[PDB]
Each structure stands twice: as structure tokens, then as C-alpha cells.
Design a protein around this ligand. Structure first.
Ligand SMILES: [Zn+2]
Ligand SMILES: [Zn+2]
Ligand SMILES: [Zn+2]
Lengths: 80, 73, 72, 44, 137
């Protein structure tokens, strides 16, 4: 017979517009959609989310984490 | 109804009631401390008494004081 | 020298595939963290750092589960 | 002994003696700033 | 009884409070009151309605109370009466009261839970209330 002295198990946490302002992913920025005449380019970050430069500028000026995945936001500068 | 109307005249009633509560509760606290100092083995029973006191105050707040700020005071 | 080039993505893809088995064969030693503190800025998306951080988050979760049992 | 209520209260007298079925004493309490009011206290 | 004495004290205090209020004419989501995971044990979880009924009842006449008193006697520290029976008795009394007594017996939150010109004025001196409003106007 055999006996178990220790063990390790594994599992995955299995579960898309601009969630922060909820406008359509390719659409414009609601903050500036109130003040019609649309200047926010989309911003990408290492954590692989796409948000509006306006949204992110404000939010980051408030807090310094990615609002979607709890990591320090890093403006993606690869390929640029 | 009358308690609410008195609560709707706020300063004097609030002040009097607050003083009375302070006095009553602090006398009670000194009494409990004096009882507790007698034997160390009573804190285990001391917990539910605090539970019931908090229960009674929460009930009073939920039934007789409309506004929040008064309740938190 | 690979950083900032195109080859970064394929190198990182290949690196993940061995770091996986290495972490499951041995806990995250000093070696993996040191190699990463050397060559980290080469990996474009920072996947390996995230695997390493994942092991630590899991130990934290173990602590919380213990407390939750006590409360129940 | 005057537990802080700024104000602090000092006892005055035992102006009567009267649930559990036991002695209940009405005791006055004169306030002093940094009018006395009566409270019904028990023996302990 | 001591409970009967308690009921008497309630009756007296209620009469006094209603008289003072009406005569003088003056007439939320739960949260811990204490804050400025083990749950808050106190936060987690009618007799007053009944007492209201007993009171408005005893404001009626004695031989007029005897029927409802008999009904209860067949149906008093604890009267776990039915909502229907209390509502029925209340509706019946809704015709037997008069004037400001009628208004008050209809003015309570329990209601939300469940010669000729002189008669109109007694039922509602709100004509005099509007006269006051006009006089101010
Ligand atoms: Zn947006
Ligand atoms: Zn915008
Ligand atoms: Zn993110």
C-alpha cells in the first residue's frame, strides 16, 4: 500500500467595449460625446486591454492601477 | 407619532437625550467593569451582554429616528 | 539584444512553454526571479512575470481560505 | 467622580426609594459646564 | 394585574399624548448605526397594532364594547387575532364614531396598514382651516 504525504493541485479560473465609459469599443468618448466637437485615440497597455485616452488620462490621474486587472498600468511602447 | 414630531425643537430634545444616554451608559459601564474585576473568568459571558445592548440601541434607531445623522450621533 | 525586435514575440512564446514545466517541477526559486530581473524588459507583454506573481497570489488565497474556515 | 458628558455631572441626593423587584433610588445629578436631572439607579 | 396595570399605563399615556399633540395643533436601507468576515450579529433580524385596536375600542361605549369583548373571549395579554377579524371590527366601528374621533381613528398609520352643517364641521372643520388660509391670504 502507498500513503500520501503531500500534494499540489491545479485549476483555472474560467470566466468587450470601453468598459470604463461603456461606449462602443470603436466608438467615441462619452465625456467628450457630451461636448460634441471626438479627439480621444484608443490606448493599449501591457495587460492587453484597450481603453480611451480620455478615460485613462482621467482615471490614472485619480488612481494608479489598471481598473480591469489590478496591475500597475503600463503604457504599451512596443512596436511604436 | 409624538416622538417623530418632537424629532421634526430638534436641538433641545437632542441635547437632553444625548446627555441622559451618556450618563446612563457610563454608569452601566463602570458597574460592569467593577463586576469583571472580581473574577477573571467572566469575559466569555461578557460578550453577549454587549451584543444585547447594541441590539437594543439598533432597534431604537430603526424604529424612532428618521434621519441618519441623528442616528450616527 | 533581442528586445525591441520582431523576434521578441516568438522568443517569449517559446520561453513560456518551458517556464511552465519548470515551475510545476520546482517552486519559484531564486533562479527564475533573478534571470527575469536581468532580461525582463525583453518580453513584450510581460507574461513570465505574471506567472511568477500568480504563485504568490495563490499562497495569499490559501491564508484567506484558512480564515474563512475558522469563521464558518 | 464626574464622568465627562465638556460637561461633568456630580450627585446631589436620594430623593426617593422604590421590574426585578428591588431597591430603585431616584438620584439627582447637577451638571457643571467645562440644571440637575434625576436618574433611577440601583444598589450595586 | 401587573400586566393589566401596564395596559392601563399605556392607555393613560396614549390619551395624554394624543391630547397634547392634537390640542396643541402641531399635527431607509439598514446600516450599522455604529460605524463612523464575521457578520454583525445585531444587524441581522402587531403588538403595537393590537394595542392601537384595544385603545380605539375602549374609546367606544361599554355595552357597545361588550359584543367585541365577547367575540374576543371566544376568539387579554396575547390576542393573536386574524387580520380579517380586526379589519372587520374596525370597519364596523368606522360608522360608530364621530367627528374628530372619527378623523383620528382614521388618521393613524394603522389605517394605511388596514345640524347638518354642524355635522360637516364636526367631521371636518377643514372649512374653518380654509377660512384661516383665506384670512392669512
Ligand atoms: Zn471610454
Ligand atoms: Zn473621449
Ligand atoms: Zn488591464
Amino acid at each position: 500500500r502507498f500513503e500520501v504525504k503531500k500534494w499540489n493541485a491545479v485549476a483555472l479560473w474560467a470566466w468587450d467595449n470601453c468598459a470604463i465609459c461603456r461606449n462602443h469599443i470603436m466608438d467615441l468618448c462619452i465625456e467628450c460625446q457630451a461636448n460634441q466637437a471626438e479627439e480621444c485615440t484608443v490606448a493599449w497597455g501591457v495587460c492587453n486591454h484597450a481603453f480611451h485616452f480620455h478615460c485613462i488620462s482621467r482615471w490614472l490621474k485619480t488612481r494608479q492601477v489598471c481598473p480591469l486587472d489590478n496591475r500597475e498600468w503600463e503604457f504599451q511602447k512596443y512596436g511604436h | 407619532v409624538f416622538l417623530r414630531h418632537l424629532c421634526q425643537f430638534w436641538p433641545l430634545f437632542r441635547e437632553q437625550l444625548c446627555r441622559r444616554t451618556c450618563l446612563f451608559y457610563t454608569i452601566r459601564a463602570q458597574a460592569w467593569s467593577r463586576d469583571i474585576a472580581e473574577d477573571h473568568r467572566r469575559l466569555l459571558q461578557l460578550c453577549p451582554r454587549l451584543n444585547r445592548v447594541l441590539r437594543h440601541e439598533q432597534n431604537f434607531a430603526d424604529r424612532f429616528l428618521p434621519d441618519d445623522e441623528a442616528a450616527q450621533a | 539584444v533581442l528586445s525591441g525586435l520582431e523576434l521578441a514575440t516568438t522568443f517569449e512564446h517559446f520561453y513560456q512553454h518551458y517556464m511552465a514545466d519548470r515551475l510545476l517541477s520546482f517552486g519559484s526559486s531564486w533562479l527564475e526571479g533573478a534571470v527575469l530581473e536581468q532580461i525582463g524588459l525583453c518580453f513584450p507583454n510581460r507574461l513570465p512575470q505574471l506567472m511568477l506573481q500568480s504563485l504568490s497570489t495563490s499562497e495569499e488565497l490559501q491564508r484567506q481560505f484558512h480564515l474563512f474556515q475558522l469563521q464558518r | 467622580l464626574m464622568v465627562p458628558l465638556r460637561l461633568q455631572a456630580y450627585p446631589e441626593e436620594l430623593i426617593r426609594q422604590r421590574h426585578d423587584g428591588h431597591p430603585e433610588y431616584l438620584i439627582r445629578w447637577s451638571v457643571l459646564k467645562c440644571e440637575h436631572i434625576l436618574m433611577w439607579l440601583s444598589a450595586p | 394585574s401587573r400586566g393589566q396595570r401596564e395596559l392601563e399605563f399605556s392607555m393613560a399615556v396614549g390619551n395624554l399624548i394624543s391630547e397634547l399633540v392634537r390640542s396643541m395643533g402641531w399635527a431607509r436601507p439598514t446600516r450599522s448605526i455604529f460605524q463612523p468576515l464575521y457578520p454583525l450579529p445585531y444587524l441581522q433580524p402587531t403588538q403595537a397594532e393590537w394595542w392601537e385596536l384595544l385603545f380605539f375600542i375602549k374609546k367606544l361605549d361599554l355595552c357597545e364594547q361588550q359584543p367585541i369583548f365577547q367575540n374576543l373571549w371566544k376568539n387579554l395579554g396575547e390576542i393573536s387575532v386574524s387580520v380579517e377579524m380586526a379589519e372587520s371590527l374596525l370597519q364596523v366601528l368606522s360608522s360608530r364614531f364621530e367627528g374628530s374621533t372619527l378623523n383620528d381613528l382614521l388618521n393613524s398609520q394603522i389605517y394605511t396598514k388596514y345640524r347638518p352643517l354642524l355635522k360637516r364641521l364636526q367631521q371636518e372643520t377643514q372649512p374653518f382651516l380654509l377660512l384661516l388660509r383665506t384670512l392669512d391670504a
